[PDB]
Q: What sequence folds into this?
């Protein structure tokens, strides 16, 4: 017997994000980390390092969208829920919007290596990842104009 069961999302209380992928949220009233699932940042650090490209853009859009979003929802996949470092493996939903899908479609990140059975919103991230590489958004923006054999 194996077909489909049922999933459900739950409301949480974001606490404070630290990176464009590592964010600390309040689950059931507890301080825990939450690493975007299937997402990866282009390495970021302090903005006072003479940066001027994608420094304060992906990490700023993550803590900024989670700070304004008065309703931060979370949805864990069917696979494991937490990793070994206690990171929360799931997808965030600010204002009812998959925060991850926004950082992947805005060329603000990359589809982290997918590892079954976690493969629900994978194909979706595949389409947003291609369109982003076709628009040269932020990360893909460095692709420059290279085409025509």
A:
């Amino acid at each position: 017997a194996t077909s489909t069961k049922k999933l459900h999302k739950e409301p949480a209380t974001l606490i404070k994000a630290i990176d464009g992928d590592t964010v600390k949220l309040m689950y059931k009233g507890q301080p825990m980390t939450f690493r975007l699932l299937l997402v990866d940042t282009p390495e970021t650090k302090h903005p006072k390092k003479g940066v001027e490209k994608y420094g304060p853009e992906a990490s700023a859009f993550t803590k900024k969208m989670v700070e304004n979003a008065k309703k931060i929802e979370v949805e864990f996949d069917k696979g494991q829920r937490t990793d070994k470092y206690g990171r929360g493996l799931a997808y965030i939903y600010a204002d009812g919007k998959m925060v991850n899908e926004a950082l992947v479609r805005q060329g603000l990140a990359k589809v982290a290596y997918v590892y079954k059975p976690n493969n629900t919103h994978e194909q979706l991230l595949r389409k947003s990842e291609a369109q982003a590489k076709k628009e040269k958004l932020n990360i893909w923006s460095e692709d420059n104009a290279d085409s025509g054999q």
Notes: The helical segments are 55-68, 99-105, 122-135.
